[PDB]
Design a protein around this ligand. Structure first.
Ligand SMILES: Nc1ncnc2c1ncn2[C@@H]1O[C@H](COP(=O)(O)OP(=O)(O)O)[C@@H](O)[C@H]1O
Ligand SMILES: Nc1ncnc2c1ncn2[C@@H]1O[C@H](COP(=O)(O)OP(=O)(O)O)[C@@H](O)[C@H]1O
Ligand SMILES: [Mg+2]
Ligand SMILES: [Mg+2]
Lengths: 359, 355
């Protein structure tokens, strides 16, 4: 294990709020001084956990690649530790470095998943509670490093400027309903290619906080779109498959509610539901009632739920599923409505994480 | 720490399924032999647990009462260990003893709740002690639910339904009844109440009435409490309105589960606060009103969990709330969920993500 990994893994990650991230964008030098230290810390924390995995998983070519990428990215970043933030060439080189790290890490999620599959096909995955624990942490860690680097790149690079209306990747006036409708349409296009029919959307909105106004919050619309798209793929598959005997499809019903503290989105289907017994299983990485695909897939890799939940929890939200077996399912996303309360939820490698590994 | 309590606490509770209770309910000697052993075991297990509680709690006159009642009952029941199952008189006497016990235990829940209120009002309670008090009270009340269930069944059978078990519990009729009980209370107190909009779906046997094996009084309790809650939230959030949004309920029978969802538009609850709702004591009402005691949610969820179902609440803050009960549909899977005083419970009485 390189000395740099051992060192930087001694620190805890420092979580930021969305409010603070929205302020990257209101000093380059301060964001450089922070990130040059924080990205190594977060890479080093997760690399210590990678080292603890089962030998037969850690030795897959896929995990060895992710480890080699993470270690290179840490080194790339530690090379900036001697530079002055007043050094304008250093700042420029730093943006180019984050662009290289971002491009290098582009296929981390699939690569890790692939390794997880080889392991499964050769040894164990859904009944291994340490692997479930690891993957929530690893993938949350990836969400958080990609969020921080992208914020710096999209505000400070010459060439990658993101949506002119966003601050980095954050929309300070995120049109929640419009994101719902867009993710619904994305899901619908895929569902049509699998079934030649898809349910319609019936949507209702309640602005409890500012009555009769458009619902907006400060949010990262790519993360919100991901959660909704995944829950809609699941609702559409459930609905079509359960109603294949019927002349028409029940709509998917969505309600979006803005209250004082929370933004809540409930997605209700008449897709026949799930036994309460298996609800927890559903949020297990790789768990799916569909065959694992080889390769435009609607279902079967078993990532939609646990990953969508990570996105909701990342800024102190949550995602829950309540089902009525024999009828249908309610999926519910909760997001904090205040940017000052939307604080990164980060894994830390410490005694208590290590130990993790009457009625 | 009497001897008999230490002795019987060494056994672990023997959980029964609802099917067992039907099958042994449709031989009095067998029930007698079973219960004169099993009741002392359950009483001794919870007694040993009472002893682990904080001193200022255990020494309230309330907890001292409960402890003397439970000890006295264990002793009354241990006295039948010297009698014969084939003995018709001992059989009669045992039923009478179970009636005494039931009478003696009649005020256990308010006496325990009184003990807790006193302690929390009087004493500083650190986070960990509070957590332990929740864990203890869930276990203590579950243990009472279970002993009352066993003793009632022997009393009703030996002194259509099999004791307190209905083998064709008309789920919807219990819903309607629990709704009307709540409604009467609501009308009397707020002068108005929401209507019920009820839907049912038999996924297991389409278009047939929904019946499972259940204990209707337990189902009634859970529904009555959840409806009180939904009615108060509706009326209070809609206090400036010409009329009230109904409370909508759907009853669904699937293969493994019976599910009942109760939906209100009484304004919801922030996610922050949802877990706190289930704390014994916790109420947004001041100290007849529908609310105040802060027992509806935790106690309903014990009834639900007792035979391996569950009770969950999810809310859209600013809009309204859904409460959901899940019951097992198969009587063989409806098995008592019982606390046991073992080294793992003991450890439970005794950070990897950043804050
Ligand atoms: N709305 C729903 N209705 C019924 N079953 C669902 C629903 N959402 C998810 N599921 C079940 O949970 C499983 C896992 O979902 P997910 O993690 O999205 O993986 P995948 O879609 O690849 O199966 C699904 O395969 C399905 O069995
Ligand atoms: N349907 C609901 N809508 C809004 N708040 C609710 C609802 N159900 C319960 N609550 C909150 O949970 C609290 C506790 O409920 P409970 O444990 O039933 O005690 P109590 O009814 O005596 O307050 C209530 O005081 C209320 O604040
Ligand atoms: Mg999916
Ligand atoms: Mg109540």
């Amino acid at each position: 294990v390189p000395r740099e990994v051992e060192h930087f893994s001694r620190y805890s990650p420092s979580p930021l709020s969305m409010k603070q991230l929205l302020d990257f964008g209101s000093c380059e030098r301060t964001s450089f001084a922070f990130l040059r230290q924080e990205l190594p810390v977060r890479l080093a924390n997760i690399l210590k956990e990678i080292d603890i995995l089962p030998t037969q998983l850690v030795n897959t070519s896929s995990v060895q690649l992710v480890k080699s990428w993470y270690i290179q990215s840490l080194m790339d970043l530690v090379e900036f530790h001697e530079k002055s933030p007043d050094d304008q060439k250093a700042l420029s080189d730093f943006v180019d470095t984050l662009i290289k790290v971002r491009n290098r890490h582009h296929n981390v999620v699939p690569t890790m998943a692939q390794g997880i599959i080889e392991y499964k096909d050769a040894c164990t995955p859904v009944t291994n509670q340490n692997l479930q624990y690891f993957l929530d942490r690893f993938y949350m860690n990836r969400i958080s490093t990609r969020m921080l680097m992208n914020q710096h790149i999209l505000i400070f690079s010459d060439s990658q400027t993101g949506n002119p209306s966003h601050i980095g990747s954050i929309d300070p006036n995120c049109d929640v309903v419009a994101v719902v409708q867009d993710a619904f349409e994305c899901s619908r296009m895929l569902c049509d290619q699998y079934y030649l029919s898809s349910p319609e959307l019936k949507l209702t909105q309640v602005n409890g906080k500012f009555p009769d106004q458009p619902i907006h919050i400060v949010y990262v619309p790519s993360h919100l779109h991901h959660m909704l798209f995944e829950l809609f793929k699941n609702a559409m598959r459930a609905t079509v498959e359960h109603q294949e005997n019927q002349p028409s499809l029940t709509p998917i019903e969505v309600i979006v509610v803005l209250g004082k503290e929370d933004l809540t989105i409930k997605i209700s289907d008449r897709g026949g539901g799930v036994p309460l017994r298996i609800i927890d299983r559903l949020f297990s990485y790789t768990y799916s009632t569909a065959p694992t695909p080889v390769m435009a897939p609607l279902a079967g890799f078993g990532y939609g739920l646990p990953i969508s939940r990570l996105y909701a929890k990342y800024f102190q939200g949550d995602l829950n599923l309540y089902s009525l077996s024999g009828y249908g399912t309610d999926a519910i996303i909760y997001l904090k409505a205040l940017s000052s309360e939307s604080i990164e939820k980060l894994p830390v490698f410490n005694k208590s994480a290590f130990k993790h590994y009457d009625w």
